[PDB]
Structures are given as structure tokens and as C-alpha cells.
PDB file of C-alpha atoms in Angstrom:
ATOM      1  CA  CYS A 794     124.994 168.440  50.634  1.00  0.00           C
ATOM      2  CA  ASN A 795     129.184 169.390  50.860  1.00  0.00           C
ATOM      3  CA  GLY A 796     128.227 170.578  47.041  1.00  0.00           C
ATOM      4  CA  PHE A 797     128.702 167.580  44.994  1.00  0.00           C
ATOM      5  CA  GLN A 798     126.021 166.966  41.799  1.00  0.00           C
ATOM      6  CA  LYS A 799     124.419 164.045  43.046  1.00  0.00           C
ATOM      7  CA  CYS A 800     123.987 165.097  46.882  1.00  0.00           C
ATOM      8  CA  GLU A 801     122.482 168.100  45.625  1.00  0.00           C
ATOM      9  CA  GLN A 802     119.885 166.335  43.599  1.00  0.00           C
ATOM     10  CA  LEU A 803     118.825 163.723  46.841  1.00  0.00           C
ATOM     11  CA  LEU A 804     118.208 167.150  48.728  1.00  0.00           C
ATOM     12  CA  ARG A 805     116.012 168.232  45.785  1.00  0.00           C
ATOM     13  CA  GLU A 806     113.791 165.832  47.112  1.00  0.00           C
ATOM     14  CA  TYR A 807     113.499 167.545  50.183  1.00  0.00           C
ATOM     15  CA  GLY A 808     113.713 171.408  48.854  1.00  0.00           C
ATOM     16  CA  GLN A 809     111.702 172.758  51.270  1.00  0.00           C
ATOM     17  CA  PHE A 810     113.320 172.308  54.614  1.00  0.00           C
ATOM     18  CA  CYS A 811     116.226 174.467  53.827  1.00  0.00           C
ATOM     19  CA  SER A 812     114.027 177.271  52.475  1.00  0.00           C
ATOM     20  CA  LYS A 813     112.250 176.523  56.438  1.00  0.00           C
ATOM     21  CA  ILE A 814     115.946 176.740  57.613  1.00  0.00           C
ATOM     22  CA  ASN A 815     117.037 179.904  55.699  1.00  0.00           C
ATOM     23  CA  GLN A 816     113.990 181.837  56.129  1.00  0.00           C
ATOM     24  CA  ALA A 817     113.707 180.818  60.039  1.00  0.00           C
ATOM     25  CA  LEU A 818     117.912 182.494  60.724  1.00  0.00           C
ATOM     26  CA  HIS A 819     116.569 185.812  58.536  1.00  0.00           C
ATOM     27  CA  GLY A 820     114.031 186.168  60.613  1.00  0.00           C
ATOM     28  CA  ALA A 821     115.751 186.086  63.560  1.00  0.00           C
ATOM     29  CA  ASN A 822     118.295 188.358  62.734  1.00  0.00           C
ATOM     30  CA  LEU A 823     115.826 190.806  61.581  1.00  0.00           C
ATOM     31  CA  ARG A 824     114.740 190.744  64.643  1.00  0.00           C
ATOM     32  CA  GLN A 825     118.387 190.967  66.663  1.00  0.00           C
ATOM     33  CA  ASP A 826     119.055 194.286  64.603  1.00  0.00           C
ATOM     34  CA  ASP A 827     115.296 196.157  65.441  1.00  0.00           C
ATOM     35  CA  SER A 828     116.054 195.089  69.235  1.00  0.00           C
ATOM     36  CA  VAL A 829     119.341 197.084  68.896  1.00  0.00           C
ATOM     37  CA  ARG A 830     118.066 200.453  67.073  1.00  0.00           C
ATOM     38  CA  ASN A 831     115.235 200.196  69.914  1.00  0.00           C
ATOM     39  CA  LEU A 832     117.936 199.955  72.680  1.00  0.00           C
ATOM     40  CA  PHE A 833     119.814 203.215  71.074  1.00  0.00           C
ATOM     41  CA  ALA A 834     117.386 204.771  69.727  1.00  0.00           C
ATOM     42  CA  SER A 835     116.283 204.626  74.186  1.00  0.00           C
ATOM     43  CA  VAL A 836     119.697 205.435  75.107  1.00  0.00           C
ATOM     44  CA  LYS A 837     120.202 208.289  72.962  1.00  0.00           C
ATOM     45  CA  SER A 838     119.434 211.376  75.351  1.00  0.00           C
ATOM     46  CA  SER A 839     119.554 214.191  73.023  1.00  0.00           C
ATOM     47  CA  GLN A 840     120.876 216.629  75.309  1.00  0.00           C
ATOM     48  CA  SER A 841     124.279 216.239  76.597  1.00  0.00           C
ATOM     49  CA  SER A 842     127.678 218.040  77.998  1.00  0.00           C
ATOM     50  CA  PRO A 843     130.724 217.578  75.406  1.00  0.00           C
TER      51      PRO A 843
ATOM     52  CA  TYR B 646     116.891 193.019  46.410  1.00  0.00           C
ATOM     53  CA  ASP B 647     115.525 195.941  46.917  1.00  0.00           C
ATOM     54  CA  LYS B 648     112.147 195.451  45.965  1.00  0.00           C
ATOM     55  CA  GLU B 649     110.799 199.274  45.188  1.00  0.00           C
ATOM     56  CA  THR B 650     113.054 199.868  42.295  1.00  0.00           C
ATOM     57  CA  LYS B 651     114.255 196.348  41.880  1.00  0.00           C
ATOM     58  CA  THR B 652     118.045 197.390  42.095  1.00  0.00           C
ATOM     59  CA  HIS B 653     119.615 193.958  43.095  1.00  0.00           C
ATOM     60  CA  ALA B 654     123.448 194.335  44.130  1.00  0.00           C
ATOM     61  CA  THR B 655     125.951 191.397  45.170  1.00  0.00           C
ATOM     62  CA  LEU B 656     128.012 191.668  48.810  1.00  0.00           C
ATOM     63  CA  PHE B 657     130.651 189.054  49.558  1.00  0.00           C
ATOM     64  CA  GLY B 658     131.130 189.049  53.232  1.00  0.00           C
ATOM     65  CA  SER B 659     134.149 189.160  54.757  1.00  0.00           C
ATOM     66  CA  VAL B 660     136.286 188.274  51.335  1.00  0.00           C
ATOM     67  CA  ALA B 661     139.436 189.631  50.086  1.00  0.00           C
ATOM     68  CA  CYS B 662     139.133 192.773  47.540  1.00  0.00           C
ATOM     69  CA  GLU B 663     141.793 191.534  45.564  1.00  0.00           C
ATOM     70  CA  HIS B 664     140.743 187.588  45.086  1.00  0.00           C
ATOM     71  CA  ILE B 665     137.357 188.449  44.022  1.00  0.00           C
ATOM     72  CA  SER B 666     136.944 189.326  39.857  1.00  0.00           C
ATOM     73  CA  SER B 667     133.927 190.137  37.488  1.00  0.00           C
ATOM     74  CA  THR B 668     133.014 186.645  35.741  1.00  0.00           C
ATOM     75  CA  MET B 669     135.190 184.952  37.886  1.00  0.00           C
ATOM     76  CA  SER B 670     136.207 181.373  36.524  1.00  0.00           C
ATOM     77  CA  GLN B 671     137.889 180.204  39.339  1.00  0.00           C
ATOM     78  CA  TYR B 672     134.940 179.056  41.405  1.00  0.00           C
ATOM     79  CA  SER B 673     132.649 175.939  40.391  1.00  0.00           C
ATOM     80  CA  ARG B 674     129.258 177.001  41.472  1.00  0.00           C
ATOM     81  CA  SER B 675     126.643 174.679  41.759  1.00  0.00           C
ATOM     82  CA  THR B 676     123.045 174.803  40.172  1.00  0.00           C
ATOM     83  CA  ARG B 677     123.424 178.138  39.897  1.00  0.00           C
ATOM     84  CA  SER B 678     123.904 179.042  36.158  1.00  0.00           C
ATOM     85  CA  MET B 679     124.591 182.390  36.777  1.00  0.00           C
ATOM     86  CA  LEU B 680     125.391 184.943  39.389  1.00  0.00           C
ATOM     87  CA  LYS B 681     123.858 189.154  39.358  1.00  0.00           C
ATOM     88  CA  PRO B 693     132.395 197.484  41.631  1.00  0.00           C
ATOM     89  CA  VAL B 694     133.865 199.159  45.036  1.00  0.00           C
TER      90      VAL B 694
END
């Protein structure tokens, strides 16, 4: 709903769909963060020559 | 949110520092009574 109040309430009819979409995307982004963190935790040799 | 001590903080993504102001009245936010600075 672009933001029109009449559209926003017709959406209140469907309210749970938006929540499902938002939660799915939030979870995917969290998993991406964890994957990056894990990968660079294994690239970290911890011993190096300057 | 910070669920452990309930200290919520608000961040604007990729937004210029000059434009945002406290209690800004230049935006018509919809169905959001109210919202709650380095």
C-alpha cells in the first residue's frame, strides 16, 4: 500500500502476509551474517609474518 | 531492540545527517502515532 490510508486498511485485512514476508527476509539476512562470520573465523590463521 | 535491558535505538539507513531532525514534522508517516543524536 503506497501509503494511501484507504489502501492501508484494505491491507489490514491481509495483515499477516506482510509480517511473514518481513520475518523471512530478516531471517535470511541473519543467516548471511552468520555465514560471513564463520567463514572469516576460519580464514583467521592467528599466526602471520608482517 | 536490545531485549535484555529494553534499550531501543533508532537508525536511519544511508540518510544524510543534515536532513533528519528530532520530532521531524516534514514526513507524513502513516498509522504510526509516534516514533522513539550522533
